Swiss-Prot record, chain A:
It is found in: Nucleus; Nucleus membrane; Cytoplasm. The chain crosses the membrane at residues 378-394. The lineage of its organism: Eukaryota, Metazoa, Chordata, Craniata, Vertebrata. The keyword Nucleus applies. Belongs to the Integrator subunit 2 family. It comes from the Eukaryota. One of its GO terms (cellular component) is nuclear membrane. It is a single-pass membrane protein. Keywords: Cytoplasm, Membrane, Nucleus, Transmembrane, Transmembrane helix. GO terms for biological process: regulation of transcription elongation by RNA polymerase II; RNA polymerase II transcription initiation surveillance; snRNA 3'-end processing; snRNA processing. Component of the Integrator complex, composed of core subunits INTS1, INTS2, INTS3, INTS4, INTS5, INTS6, INTS7, INTS8, INTS9/RC74, INTS10, INTS11/CPSF3L, INTS12, INTS13, INTS14 and INTS15. The core complex associates with protein phosphatase 2A subunits PPP2CA and PPP2R1A, to form the Integrator-PP2A (INTAC) complex. This is Integrator complex subunit 2. It comes from Homo sapiens (Human). Component of the integrator complex, a multiprotein complex that terminates RNA polymerase II (Pol II) transcription in the promoter-proximal region of genes.
Swiss-Prot record, chain B:
The chain holds residues 439 to 943 of 962 of the full protein. The modification Phosphoserine is found at S371. Component of the integrator complex, a multiprotein complex that terminates RNA polymerase II (Pol II) transcription in the promoter-proximal region of genes. Component of the Integrator complex, composed of core subunits INTS1, INTS2, INTS3, INTS4, INTS5, INTS6, INTS7, INTS8, INTS9/RC74, INTS10, INTS11/CPSF3L, INTS12, INTS13, INTS14 and INTS15. The core complex associates with protein phosphatase 2A subunits PPP2CA and PPP2R1A, to form the Integrator-PP2A (INTAC) complex. Interacts with NABP2. Keywords: Chromosome, Cytoplasm, DNA damage, Nucleus, Phosphoprotein. The keyword Phosphoprotein applies. It is found in: Nucleus; Chromosome; Cytoplasm. This is Integrator complex subunit 7.
Swiss-Prot record, chain C:
It comes from Homo sapiens (Human). There is a cross-link at K68 (Glycyl lysine isopeptide (Lys-Gly) (interchain with G-Cter in SUMO2)). This is Integrator complex subunit 4. There is a cross-link at K68 (Glycyl lysine isopeptide (Lys-Gly) (interchain with G-Cter in SUMO1)). It comes from the Eukaryota. The chain holds residues 724 to 963 of 963 of the full protein. Belongs to the Integrator subunit 4 family.
Length: 628, 497, 216
């Protein structure tokens, strides 16, 4: 078989007579009915330019014997046939030779009557099918020899009997014949403008979430043939199918054809763009419907590569391969998008991945990026994905690789922060995760990962419970979280506005337990830089933080080790804040509160201090009176 | 020339504001502005950025049609001179805002290989594709129907990628509602134009053959000089009216943009309704319309050259159609020519993505947490069916930015309706109350009556209303499911009776 | 005259929005009838109405009758554009009517309770200041929650007259409705009728109502 060339279809649409000349003979043979109707029928428009176009059509007309046959077809009266068809239809509502042989031997009007009766019977069958797809057999339409003239006569009937033969009805009924795709392609090619209308009719009359039924396969193949006929308008069908929420297989297939057509490796693949949009698109109905498609595709255990799902998965894996090499610079953002896309596929759709897929994902996630802002974001998404999907790591090999990667990170957590310049969102995130693990807030861990990933997916607590051993036992211990806490950057412009769980909460929690003094880490260097930085209004944590800090400066961690004592801030350091006005208002009010509370606590808890004999620096009158 | 790079920003702002009115104020002064632009890199270092962006805005405003070598000269000026990513982004934004889409695609391409989070990459890519599609559209030729269809198809082949990327860019935060929806309806508009142009071209596609064969041409039953194209003309007319009303939905949903984006949206709706009126009054019954464009027209009150050009195009189309109302029969001999020329004119003026698209201000919202008998899950709630239900719809209005920057909420017109879940579809209980929020908080008692077994859906729609008095349809549009049961006492009573 | 002006404005806007020749003609004929009725009725003071909208419209009326509505609307538009502003004469000492609902106060959170289907009587007490013919005009309006508004005419005996032009209204308003799950708000307001339509001239008050279903 041969379909109408896309160039031929576009030439017909643009009524480009000169291009009609360029068209080859078989294309003209396929397109004859419209052309001859154009050349013979009385011209609707009577412009001289159109007259010359008609002269060109006549120039092209020669070389076809079927022209005479089509003229004979047109010769037959149509009013009588129409009334007969109406009466027969009403009756329906209330030959020794095969149909092909009858079509052949009988004359043109008999051919019209036969084909018209057959099509109307098919239409009635479809109308009564109540949406149940079936198949109808007709040797006439299944005869390869008589295909051409069958289609020719059908085109004339459609042109001449609009009311009796609505185009969309003809299309949907025709779907049920063996070569309905080919008849439909030729018929639509005959009348260009109806292309989009037929596209709408088929999609509307299609099913919702079935790509395995024979009807679904036939319908999607017909639409694919139409798109191949008109590539320029293909993506309109894509938008239509996305809107109507039918035939997701067709929706993805169109995208596969378009991405094959276009080759732009510089940017992310339009496939990635589209699937990311559908899954993460703000809409909800589309999200649920597409998730249903993925669920059905995976639940179909049979491994058939002709499946659009499998084609799409192969395409995504191959796209990932080009990215995967450390890691190149410009590839960071593109890798991030694919990482999030697969995160969605496993989480918000339950796309069970194969072993090689898991291997490639592990490789990418463990890949070292450059310490740029994009690298910071990419490592954040990588670690969060590993947090969420523990099933990605099963064998001790991936376990060891992951542990190695995390160990490499922990030395570069704050180093990454400084190199990138931006506040280390992951740098505080790692501290947060470690604290949440040690204190068994798996719900909070889930909440954090969902937020950072940007998609609310479901996680089994046991999955994280497994990794808890990996996390709290060797990679992160008390004296390691202690190491991180002091080096974490201080929160900028702190206030009550910045909501969530800021590092101040974690510092306060650590000081509650007095880990800092146990593991000999100075903390004033941090608290002072934070208090120099706070602004208005006041975050509800600072005051309890200062209280616990001063209580630590005075009281020891343990009786057996009286030496446990944080260093109080230096008076010279205090002076700078009050020298004036480089600082804020709440900047120095907190420090005034701290100094007053400290002078008070010295006298209040002087018993244990006398027991220790580590009397700290009582500040000089020079400072105490210079304070306004 | 003589301003020492401190007053230059102010002067350029003034000049842009002036040129926003009349075009001869920008058309002929192209070279000198670029002479100022080229020396920027060396004449200052402290605040190069602001004067750079200002000069970019003024040069784009002056450049009406397109950009010459001056374009590459700007590109280099940015490259060699200190040029922040933020800065180049603002120049690109202004370029896109003034319509010089040619520069936008180039600049955004340079941007794409930047930024860290994927959201911004997707947004930048979407904007680049939109700008490129607009540039492709600009290459239209006057009165040549062949090239028009190909150009439109190509520009649509690009908008679709753009929409995919933009829809991907959305998040639970700042879900790009207006940006996405406006552009999507723009693609809908262009598809309508493509369908219409195809239909009018197909006019010559043996249309007369159908009507004469079906019935005698004289006293045509299908239509006065009936033709197959009549059905398509009805179809497209209906589609265009529907699209016009969809702009109505977008407009009455924004409520947040300044007085500029709103006028732009109204303008697009006017274009759509214009094509609809033209097709309906010229192809369909012209004598039925028989309406004269007897109204004040062309008064120079427009606030932007874009609006002025559109108003000129509208006047041209009207003055053509009024003349061509009765000349020929509905057979559409030259009517196709008028329609095609109107389409070409409408597409000629490229576009202008308006402010609200970029950067949102005056964030206002309605929380509207109704407090009926609360239902933790979607499990329906019960009511004995014989007595009544009371809702207690509670609502609080929340302002992020300056509360009343442009429009200040005056009243909230809560509209409650119910429908029968299992099946006028049982809208017996459909009522409304206009509660005025006194400080920030408004409660309203609503009573719902219903005596049917099946479940019921309860819908509440906010419909804020501002000082002047407008619908301004917004609001979460929350739903609550309510179950309905009857006492077995009454069940047995009905059974016995 | 100002009401006629507003009618003209309404006509012009409606014609602007609508293209139907038959509706246009109908509305134009109604408006012309209104103009004629006005000039007949206020035959007097027309000379005082110098250079007024109505004055020039009446002066140019016949050709308006002859012409088709399509141009009549444009004529009316330009006519209003060029119309002048009348000088309103200030009267002698006057007052604007005013009602104040004293009981029920309406701020009492305790609901009035009663069995379903039966009725509860709400005492209504109001002061009406500077009203002519209070007994034939003032009417108590009760808006139930569900959107239904009931109008109540008080008896001619409900209106005491303690002093000059300062009447008191004392009456009962009868409320009733089927059973409600929780307390609701019934709004009580005082309306003024005219000879056709009504004008609120008072602050609506809220009363808590609770119909419980029948007992044993």
């Amino acid at each position: 078989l041969q379909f109408v060339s896309p160039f031929a279809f576009e030439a017909m649409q643009k009524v480009d007579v000169v291009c009609l000349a360029s068209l080859s003979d078989p294309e003209l043979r396929l397109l004859l009915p419209c052309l001859v109707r154009m050349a013979l029928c009385a011209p609707a428009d009577q412009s001289q330019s159109w007259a010359q176009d008609k002269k060109l059509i006549l120039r092209l007309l020669s070389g076809v014997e079927a022209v005479n046959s089509i003229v004979a077809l047109l010769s037959v009266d149509f009013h009588a046939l129409e009334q007969d068809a109406s009466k027969e239809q009403q009756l329906r509502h209330k030959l020794q030779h095969g149909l092909t042989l009858e079509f052949e031997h009988s004359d043109s009007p008999r051919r019209l009557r036969l084909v018209l009766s057959e099509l109307l019977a098919i239409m009635n069958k479809v109308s009564e099918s109540n949406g149940e797809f079936f198949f109808k057999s007709s040797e006439l339409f299944e005869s390869p020899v008589y295909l051409e003239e069958a289609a020719d006569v059908l085109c004339i009937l459609q042109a001449e009997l609009p009311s009796l033969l609505p185009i969309v009805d003809v299309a949907e009924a025709l779907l049920h014949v063996r070569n309905g795709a080919w008849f439909l392609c030729l018929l639509v090619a005959n009348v260009p403008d109806s292309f989009n209308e037929v596209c709408r009719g088929l999609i509307k009359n299609g099913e919702r979430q079935d790509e395995e039924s024979l009807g679904g396969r036939r319908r999607t193949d017909a639409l694919r043939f139409l798109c191949k006929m008109n590539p320029s308008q293909a993506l309109k069908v894509r938008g239509m199918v996305v809107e109507e929420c039918h035939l997701p297989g067709l929706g993805v297939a169109l995208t596969l054809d378009h991405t094959k057509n276009e080759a732009c490796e510089d940017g992310v693949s339009d496939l990635v763009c589209f699937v990311s949009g559908l899954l993460l698109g703000t809409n909800a109905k589309v999200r649920t419907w597409f998730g249903t498609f993925i669920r059905n595709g995976q639940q179909r255990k049979r491994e058939t590569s002709s499946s659009v799902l499998w084609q799409m998965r192969r395409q995504l894996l191959l796209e990932l391969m080009g990215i995967l090499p450390g890691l190149k610079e410009e590839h960071v953002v593109k890798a991030s998008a694919l990482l999030r896309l697969y995160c969605a596929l496993m989480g918000i759709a339950g796309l069970k991945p194969t072993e090689e897929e898991a291997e490639q994902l592990l490789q990418l996630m463990t890949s070292r990026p450059p310490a740029t802002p994009a690298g910071v974001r990419f490592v954040s998404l990588s670690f969060c994905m590993l947090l969420a999907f523990s099933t990605l790591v099963s064998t001790p090999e991936q376990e060891q690789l992951m542990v190695v990667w995390l160990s490499w990170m922990i030395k570069e957590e704050a180093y990454f922060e400084s190199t990138s310049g931006v506040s280390a969102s992951f740098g505080e995130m790692l501290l947060l995760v470690a604290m949440y693990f040690h204190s068994n807030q798996l719900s909070a861990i889930i909440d954090l990962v969902c937020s950072t990933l940007g998609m609310k997916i479901v996680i089994k607590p046991s999955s994280l419970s497994r990794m808890k051993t990996i996390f709290t036992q060797e990679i992160f211990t008390e004296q390691v979280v202690t190491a991180h806490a002091v080096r974490v950057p201080v929160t900028s412009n702190l206030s009550a506005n910045i909501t969530g769980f800021l590092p101040i909460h974690c510092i306060y929690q650590l000081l509650r337990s007095r880990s800092f003094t146990k593991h000999k880490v100075s903390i004033k260097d941090w608290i002072y830089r934070q208090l120099c930085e706070t602004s208005t209004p006041l975050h509800p944590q600072l005051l309890p933080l200062i209280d616990v800090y001063i209580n630590s400066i005075l009281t020891p961690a343990s009786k057996s080790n009286p030496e446990a004592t944080n260093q109080p801030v230096t008076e010279q350091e205090i002076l700078n804040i009050f020298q004036g006005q480089r600082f804020s208002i709440t900047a120095q009010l907190l420090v005034l509160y701290y100094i007053l509370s400290y002078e008070e606590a010295l006298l209040a808890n002087t018993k244990t201090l006398a027991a220790m004999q580590r009397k700290p620096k009582s500040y000089s009158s020079s400072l105490m009176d210079q304070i306004p | 020339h003589s301003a020492q790079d401190a007053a230059r920003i102010l002067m350029c702002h003034c000049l842009a504001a002036i040129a926003m009115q009349l075009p001869v104020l920008g058309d002929g002064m192209l070279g000198d502005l670029m002479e100022l632009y080229k020396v920027i890199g060396r004449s200052a270092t402290d605040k190069q950025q602001e004067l750079l962006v200002s000069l970019a805005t003024v040069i784009f405003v002056a450049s009406q049609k397109a950009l010459s070598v001056e374009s590459k000269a700007v590109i280099k000026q940015q490259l060699e001179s200190v040029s922040n990513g933020w800065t180049v982004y603002r120049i690109a934004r202004q370029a896109s805002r003034m319509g010089n889409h040619d520069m936008a695609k180039e600049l955004y391409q340079s941007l794409l290989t930047q930024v860290a989070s994927e959201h911004f990459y997707f947004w930048l890519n979407s904007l680049k594709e939109f700008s490129h599609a607009e540039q492709c559209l600009t290459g239209l030729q006057e009165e040549n129907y062949s090239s028009a269809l190909s150009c439109i198809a190509e520009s649509l082949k690009f908008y679709h990628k753009g929409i995919a990327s933009l829809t991907a860019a959305s998040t639970p935060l700042n879900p790009l509602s207006f940006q996405c929806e406006f552009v999507k309806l723009r693609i809908d508009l262009l598809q309508a134009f493509s369908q219409l142009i195809c239909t009018c071209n197909s006019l010559k596609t043996s249309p007369p053959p159908a009507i004469a064969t079906t019935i005698a041409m004289t006293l045509g039953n299908d239509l006065q000089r009936c033709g197959r194209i009549s059905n398509q003309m009805k179809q497209s007319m209906e589609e265009f009216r529907s699209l016009a009303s969809r702009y109505g939905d977008l407009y009455q949903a924004s409520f947040d943009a300044d007085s500029a984006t709103l006028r732009n949206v109204e303008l697009q709706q006017q274009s759509c309704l214009l094509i609809s009126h033209a097709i309906e009054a010229l192809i369909l019954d012209p004598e039925s319309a028989s309406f004269q464009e007897y109204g004040s027209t062309g008064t120079a009150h427009a606030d932007s050259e874009y609006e002025r050009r559109m108003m000129s195009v509208y006047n041209h189309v009207l003055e053509e159609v009024e003349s061509l109302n009765r000349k020929y029969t509905p057979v559409s001999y030259m009517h196709t020519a008028c329609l095609c020329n109107a389409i070409i004119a409408l597409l000629k003026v490229p576009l202008s993505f308006q402010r609200y698209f970029f950067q949102k201000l005056q964030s206002t919202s309605i929380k509207l947490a109704l407090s009926p008998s609360p239902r933790n899950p979607a499990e329906p709630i019960a009511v004995q069916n014989n007595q009544q239900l009371a809702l207690k719809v509670e609502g609080v209005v929340q302002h992020g930015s300056k509360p009343g920057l442009f429009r200040k909420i005056q009243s909230v017109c809560l509209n409650v309706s119910s429908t029968l879940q299992s099946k006028i579809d049982n809208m017996t209980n459909e009522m409304e109350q206009r509660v005025e929020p006194h400080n920030d908080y408004f409660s309203t008692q609503f009573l719902l009556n219903f005596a049917i077994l099946g479940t019921h859906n309860i819908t509440v729609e906010s419909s804020v209303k501002d000082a002047n008095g407008i619908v301004w349809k917004t609001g979460p549009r929350t739903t609550i499911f309510v179950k309905s049961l009857e006492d077995p006492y009454s069940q047995q009573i009905r059974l016995q009776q | 005259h100002m009401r006629l002006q507003a009618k003209a404005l309404q006509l012009i806007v409606t014609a602007r929005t609508t293209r139907g020749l038959d509706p246009l003609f109908g509305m134009c004929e109604k408006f012309l009838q209104e103009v004629d009725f006005f000039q007949r009725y206020f035959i007097a003071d027309l000379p005082h109405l110098q250079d007024s909208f109505v004055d020039k419209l009446l002066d140019l009326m016949p050709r308006l009758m002859t012409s088709k509505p399509a141009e009549v609307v444009k004529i009316l538009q330009t006519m209003l554009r060029q119309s002048a502003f009348l000088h309103l004469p200030l009267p002698e000492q006057i007052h604007k009517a005013s009602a104040t609902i004293i009981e029920p106060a309406g701020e009492s959170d305790n609901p009035l309770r009663f069995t379903s289907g039966l009725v509860v009587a709400l005492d209504v007490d109001a002061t009406l200041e500077h009203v002519q013919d209070p007994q034939n005009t003032v009417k108590v309006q009760v808006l139930y929650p569900d959107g239904q508004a009931q109008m109540i005419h008080p008896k001619p005996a409900d209106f005491r007259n303690p002093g000059p032009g300062r009447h008191r209204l004392i009456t009962q308003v009868y409320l009733s409705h089927t059973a409600w799950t929780e307390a609701c708000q019934v709004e009580v307001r005082l309306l003024l009728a005219y000879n056709e339509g009504t004008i609120p001239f008072s602050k609506p008050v809220k009363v808590y109502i609770m119909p419980k279903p029948a007992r044993r």
